[PDB]
């Protein structure tokens, strides 16, 4: 069956694979070393160490689980799917879950930073470490809950001619067009638009209030660092995840009569692009930490 074949040249495949492996080593090393750094730490920074830690985790997972599977079955061999039903559902579930976790962690970091720069005297009277860990757990669980629909949206289908050819066994939405549009819309709003709009607003307010504070010790230095970092994280998240959601909307909103061979090949090269950006997002955070902070850089190099 040559109907499930994706027409992308070997050049793009090798290139994307190379970029993928680079982001793999840089990302995994960066995030793992980040975790180990936050482990041997020793006070709101100690809380943002949890958040950061969480983020690292949310990256590592995607780098250690999502990347190999996606490389193989989504870049190198589009059919048949080789990880079964549980792999099919679990993949997308993990994807969405980690996305939600990352976004919520970003917004939470925005709020915590705001409280850090506006009411530091009320902030030192701190939400305890235990309550912070509880909040991280709450974020993760909420992310899983919001990722639930992927367990029922995706599955295995035999898209071969007779529907009996083992090579036609692919991982795909096992749901009609309209409902798919619905869950994709929900994910686009809740994992991207809404929390990043909130985070961007909060970061603008953070910038302004930082300016006001400057106009009013090492607390100012660390605060400014946190501001620039968080800004960079929000911007990077938006930029990296923007084309991704556009593609998934493109997947279900284009009618059958409009789908040409051009739009097909383009869809898959665009898949390469958007997902490459996704892994860029998966590898960006530890790089930013090393640039802005001399300390974290020294400890990062202490491990390595």
């Amino acid at each position: 069956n040559s109907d499930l074949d994706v027409n992308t040249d070997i050049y793009s495949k090798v290139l994307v694979t190379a970029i993928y492996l680079a982001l793999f080593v840089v990302g995994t090393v960066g995030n793992s070393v980040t975790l180990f750094t936050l482990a041997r730490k020793k006070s709101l920074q100690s809380t943002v160490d949890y958040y950061l830690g969480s983020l690292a985790l949310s990256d590592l997972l995607i780098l250690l689980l999502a990347m190999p599977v996606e490389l193989y079955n989504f870049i190198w061999v589009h059919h048949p799917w080789a990880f079964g039903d549980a792999g099919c559902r679990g993949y997308y579930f993990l994807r969405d879950a980690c996305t939600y976790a990352t976004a919520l962690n970003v917004v939470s970091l925005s709020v915590e930073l705001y409280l850090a720069i506006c009411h530091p005297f009320k902030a030192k009277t701190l939400m305890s470490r235990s309550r912070t860990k509880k909040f991280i757990s709450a974020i993760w669980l909420a992310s899983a809950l919001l990722a639930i629909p992927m367990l029922f949206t995706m599955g295995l289908q035999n898209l071969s001619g007779d529907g009996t050819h083992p090579g036609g066994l692919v991982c795909t939405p096992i749901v009609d067009t309209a409902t798919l549009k619905v869950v994709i819309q929900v994910n686009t709003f809740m994992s991207f638009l809404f929390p990043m709009l909130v985070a961007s607003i909060l970061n603008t307010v953070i910038a302004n209030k930082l300016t006001v504070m400057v106009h009013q010790p090492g607390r100012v230095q660390a605060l400014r660092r946190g501001v620039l970092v968080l800004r960079a994280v929000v911007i990077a998240f938006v930029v990296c995840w923007l084309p991704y959601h556009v593609r998934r909307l493109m997947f279900c909103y284009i009618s059958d009569e409009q789908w040409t061979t051009f739009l097909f090949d383009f869809y898959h090269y665009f898949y390469m692009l958007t997902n490459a950006l996704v892994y860029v997002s998966a590898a960006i955070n530890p790089i930013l930490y090393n640039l802005v902070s001399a300390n974290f850089r020294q400890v990062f190099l202490s491990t390595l």
Binding site: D3, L4, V6, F74, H78, Y92, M154, Q157, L159, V170, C171, T172, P173, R248, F251, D256, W259, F264, Y267, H268, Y271
Partner: peptide, 6 residues
């Protein structure tokens, strides 16, 4: 045809 990979 239509893509099957989301």
């Amino acid at each position: 045809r239509r893509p099957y990979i989301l």
